[PDB]
């Protein structure tokens, strides 16, 4: 049962895991790089919000290619958890 | 922290009646609410999920509704086995929060309790302590008021209560109240009285035995 | 065939630590989030802890944060609960529950569907009390009066630990009018219950009433005769 969206999604994830494979250790209080199942984020300094271009696995990525998804890094040095503790982010720009 | 206010704590119903249990969330939880049934001595068992959905293999008389902040559990016609405790659960945010719970008890006519009082047993006195027990037998409703008096001196802090589950046979309640004290205190005081205040009583009953095997 | 079984419960003194286990079968253990839920003796339901797959997502109810630890061994489909520095508020039955989630790719949302399957549970009692058999005391019939209508009698099962205790009447022959009350926890930390039965006042003098108290924990088995008094 081919799922073309899933296959492209697995591709983006594979790509992100590696690219964060090379990047060298952080020199300050950060939020560890990660693939939060949506986008790949680098090591982000505490108390700062990170940005990324909308993921290309999205079917409408040609209409939101110029938009951004955001992910907040707390002063703790910890990424932001949604109510249930899952990976949290602002992908409003990227939505259909 | 989402508070789950459930109402009522306990309700009154006759088999075949329509029952309604409400759940109010302090914060919007969409349809991330579910209802649970718990029979005495057993683990909870979900009946309604997603607020409006019925779990597989559950009677069609159970139905949930509502979304956001207000929710309702409904039983179109209560059944003899439905008379048990129910809980609502919110799984929207951490922490996961349950309602206070609702105990559904089968309704009947009023029934005054038959009261009995038992003085300490000789075998016990030999130990150095004396327990005086008072029995309120097969009464209704559960609401009852028991009072101890020695030398007509209202006692407080030296007794404990216990109430039985609603009887399957007559649907009544019975409670035991153990007034406990030392062999010393028991033998310098004079009259031991068990005062019962109830609804089925057009006047408070008081059963007193006096300082002996009596 | 999908089931949950919690074990490891028992009696433990405050300050000491206990470990609970939860075995799963009938379903793919790795694919679900697991919860612990507890219920104090006479109280309602309370959520305590939760792990998912990762386990980068563990959350606890406030009263147990920095005190309880949740973990899982997926090889043998088992969930654990580390309970440290135990105290009175921890006394309860502990359940383990299953919850499914779902990640929507297009949206990026994570959907949770709540606890759908529970285990029977396992009891944890935190107390410094030692195992003790109950002293069985009689309650005699007839109060002040005699021979008129209906009367009541029973047995006082006092100062035992821990729960439970089974009470019978005439080796089980008598089951009518008998009210075995739920045990109360005395200020001393020991339990005490009353077992009672109502009989026709005429049955006195002929019928012999014996309560059969059984306290497994202390291997204590007592049969007590209940006779009228004099005065
Ligand atoms: C976060 O950054 C803001 C703006 O840079 C700054 O004013 C504030 O001091 C920082 N907050 C912290 C460190 O909690
Ligand atoms: C995205 O992050 C970069 C790097 O900090 C920042 O300079 C840029 O302003 C951000 N872009 C947007 C659109 O917010």
The CATH number covering residue C141 comes to: 2.60.40.10
Q: How far is B52 from chain A (nearest CA, A)?
A: 21
Q: How far is A6 from chain C (nearest CA, A)?
A: 8
Write out the two tokens for B172.
């009544």
Residue where one domain finishes, among candidates B58, B86, B108: B108
Residues of B with Cβ-Cβ distance to C158 under 8 angstroms: 124, 131
Q: Which residues, 6+ apart, have CB-to-CB distance to C106 below 8 Å? A: A5, A58, A59, A96
- Are B98 and C135 an interchain contact pair (Cβ–Cβ within 8 Å)? no
Question: B34, B42, B101, B118: which to substitute to probe chain C, counting the most C Cβ within 10 Å?
Answer: B118
Residue where one domain finishes, among candidates C102, C128, C154: C128
SS3 of residue B72 by DSSP: strand
Residue carrying the six token digits 């271009």 = A53
Distance A71 CA to ligand 1 centre (A): 16
Same structural domain, C148 and C115: no
Residue where one domain finishes, among candidates B63, B80, B108: B108
Same structural domain, B2 and B78: yes
Same structural domain, B143 and B213: yes
Minimal CA–CA distance to C154: which of C231, C206, C221, C209? C209
Q: Please, which residues bridge with residue C183 across strands?
A: none
Q: Which ligand is nearest the CA of A74, by number?
A: 1
Which residue has the least CA distance to atom 7 on ligand 2?
A: A51
- Are A91 and C108 an interchain contact pair (Cβ–Cβ within 8 Å)? yes
Which structural domain, as residue segments, surrounds residue B33? 1-108
Strand-pair category, C68-73 with C209-215: unpaired
Write out the two tokens for C203.
């049955």
Same structural domain, B100 and B201: no
Which structural domain, as residue segments, surrounds residue A91? 1-96
Distance C66 CA to ligand 1 centre (A): 28
Q: Please, which residues bridge with residue C211 across strands?
A: C169, C224
Residues of B with Cβ-Cβ distance to C222 under 8 angstroms: none
Minimal CA–CA distance to C228: which of A62, B122, A51, B159? B122
Same structural domain, C37 and C52: yes
Distance A33 CA to ligand 1 centre (A): 21
Tell me how many domains chain A contains: 1
Q: Which residues, 6+ apart, have CB-to-CB distance to B201 below 8 Å? A: B112
Residue where one domain finishes, among candidates B108, B123, B139: B108
B105-117 burial, b at 16+ Cβ within 10 Å, e below that, comes to: bbbeeebbbbbbb
How far, rounded to the nearest angstrom, does the alpha carbon of residue C95 sit from its chain's CA centroid? 12
Same structural domain, B84 and B8: yes
Query: Mutation test of ligand 1: which of A47, A74, A78 has the most ligand atoms closer than 8 Å to its C-beta?
Result: A47
Same structural domain, C7 and C121: yes
Residues of C with Cβ-Cβ distance to A58 under 8 angstroms: 106
Tell me how many domains chain C contains: 2
Q: Which ligand is nearest the CA of A70, by number?
A: 2
Same structural domain, C141 and C216: yes
CA atoms of B211 and C13, how far apart (whole Å): 40
B182 touches chain C (CB under 8 A): no
Distance B32 CA to ligand 1 centre (A): 35
Tell me the helices (H) and strands (E) count for chain B, helix number first: 2, 19
Count of other CB atoms within 10 angstroms of residue C76: 10
Same structural domain, C122 and C64: yes
The ligand 1 atom at the shortest distance from the C-alpha of residue A75 is: 14
Q: What is the CATH number of the domain that holds A38?
A: 4.10.1240.10
Method of elucidation: X-ray
Q: What is the CATH number of the domain that holds B169?
A: 2.60.40.10
Same structural domain, B76 and B123: no
Minimal CA–CA distance to C74: which of C49, C53, C44? C53
Count of other CB atoms within 10 angstroms of residue C182: 15
Same structural domain, C2 and C111: yes
Which residue has the least CA distance to atom 11 on ligand 1?
A: A47
Same structural domain, C115 and C142: no
**Which residue from C57, C105, C108 is facing A85, i.e. has the nearest CB?**
C57
Which structural domain, as residue segments, surrounds residue C99? 1-128
Residues of B with Cβ-Cβ distance to A85 under 8 angstroms: 94
A51 lines ligand 2 (CB under 6 A): yes
CA atoms of B79 and B84, how far apart (whole Å): 10
Same structural domain, C133 and C117: no
Same structural domain, C54 and C84: yes
A70 lines ligand 2 (CB under 6 A): no
Same structural domain, B14 and B100: yes
Same structural domain, B192 and B209: yes
Residues of C with Cβ-Cβ distance to B44 under 8 angstroms: 37, 45, 95, 118
Residue carrying the six token digits 């982010």 = A89
Same structural domain, B87 and B155: no
Tell me how many domains chain B contains: 2
Residue where one domain finishes, among candidates C105, C128, C151: C128
Which residue has the least CA distance to atom 1 on ligand 2?
A: A51
Contact C141, C151 (CB under 8 A): yes
In DSSP notation, chain C reads --EEEEE--EEE-TTS-EEEEEEEESS-GGGSEEEEEEE-TTS--EEEEEE-SSSS--EE-GGGTTTEEEEEEGGGTEEEEEE-S--GGG-EEEEEEEEEEEE-TTT--EEEEEEEEE---EEEEE-SPPPBPPEEEEE-S-SS--SSSEEEEEEEEEEEBSS--EEEEGGGT--SSEEEPPPEE-TTS-EEEEEEEEEEGGGTTTS-EEEEEEEGGGTEEEEEEE-----
Residue where one domain finishes, among candidates C80, C110, C128: C128
Q: How far is B51 from chain C (nearest CA, A)?
A: 11
Count of other CB atoms within 10 angstroms of residue A83: 17
Which residue has the least CA distance to atom 9 on ligand 2?
A: A51
Query: How big is the A-B interface in CB pairs under 8 Å?
Result: 8
- The chains found to touch C (3+ Cβ pairs under 8 angstroms) are A, B
Write out the two tokens for B30.
């969409």
Same structural domain, C27 and C78: yes
């Amino acid at each position: 049962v081919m799922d073309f969206l899933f296959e492209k999604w697995k591709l983006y994830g594979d790509q992100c895991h590696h690219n964060l494979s090379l990047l060298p250790p952080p020199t300050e209080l950060v939020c560890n790089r990660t693939f939060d199942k949506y986008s790949c984020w680098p090591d982000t300094p505490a108390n700062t919000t990170a940005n990324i271009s909308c993921p290309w696995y999205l079917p409408w990525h040609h209409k939101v290619q110029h938009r951004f998804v955001f992910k907040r890094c707390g002063p703790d040095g910890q990424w932001v958890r949604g109510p249930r503790g899952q990976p949290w982010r602002d992908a409003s720009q990227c939505q259909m | 922290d989402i508070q789950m206010t459930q109402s009522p704590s306990s309700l009154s119903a006759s088999v075949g009646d329509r029952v309604t249990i409400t759940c109010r969330a302090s914060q919007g939880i969409r349809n991330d609410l579910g209802w649970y049934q718990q029979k005495p001595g057993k683990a909870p068992k979900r009946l309604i999920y997603a607020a409006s959905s019925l779990e597989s293999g559950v009677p069609s008389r159970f139905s949930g509704s509502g979304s956001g902040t207000e929710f309702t559990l409904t039983i179109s016609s209560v059944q003899p086995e439905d008379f048990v405790t129910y809980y609502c659960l919110q799984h929207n945010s951490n922490p996961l929060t349950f309602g206070g719970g609702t105990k559904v008890e089968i309704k009947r006519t009023v029934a005054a309790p038959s009261v009995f009082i038992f003085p300490p047993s000789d075998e016990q006195l030999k130990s150095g302590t004396a327990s005086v027990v008072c029995l309120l037998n097969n009464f209704y409703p559960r609401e009852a008021k028991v009072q101890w008096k020695v030398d007509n001196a209202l006692q407080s802090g030296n007794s404990q209560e216990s109430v039985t589950e609603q009887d399957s046979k007559d649907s009544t309640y019975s409670l035991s109240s153990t007034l406990t004290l030392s062999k010393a205190d028991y033998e310098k005081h004079k009259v031991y009285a068990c005062e019962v205040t109830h609804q089925g009583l057009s006047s408070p009953v008081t059963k007193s035995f006096n300082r002996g095997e009596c | 065939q999908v089931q949950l079984v919690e074990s490891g419960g028992g009696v433990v003194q405050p300050g000491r630590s206990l470990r609970l286990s939860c075995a799963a079968s009938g379903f793919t253990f790795s694919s679900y989030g697991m919860h612990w839920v507890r219920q104090a003796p006479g109280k309602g339901l309370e959520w305590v802890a939760v792990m998912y797959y990762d386990g980068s997502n563990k959350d606890y109810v406030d009263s147990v944060k920095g005190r309880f630890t949740i973990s899982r061994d997926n090889s043998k489909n088992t969930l654990y609960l580390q309970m440290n520095r135990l105290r009175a508020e921890d006394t309860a039955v502990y359940y383990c529950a299953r919850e499914k989630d779902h990640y929507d790719i297009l949206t990026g949302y994570n959907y949770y569907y709540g606890l759908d399957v529970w285990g029977q549970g396992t009891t944890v009692t935190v107390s410094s009390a030692s195992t003790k058999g109950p002293s069985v005391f009689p309650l005699a019939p007839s109060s002040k009066s005699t021979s008129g209508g209906t009367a009541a009698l029973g047995c006082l099962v006092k100062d035992y630990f821990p729960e439970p205790v089974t009470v019978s009447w005439n080796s089980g022959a008598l089951t009518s009018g008998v009210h075995t009350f739920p045990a109360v926890l005395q200020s001393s930390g020991l339990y005490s219950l009353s077992s009672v039965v109502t009989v026709p006042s005429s049955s006195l003098g002929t019928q012999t009433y014996i309560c059969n108290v059984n306290h497994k924990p202390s291997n204590t088995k007592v049969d007590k005769k209940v006779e009228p008094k004099s005065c």
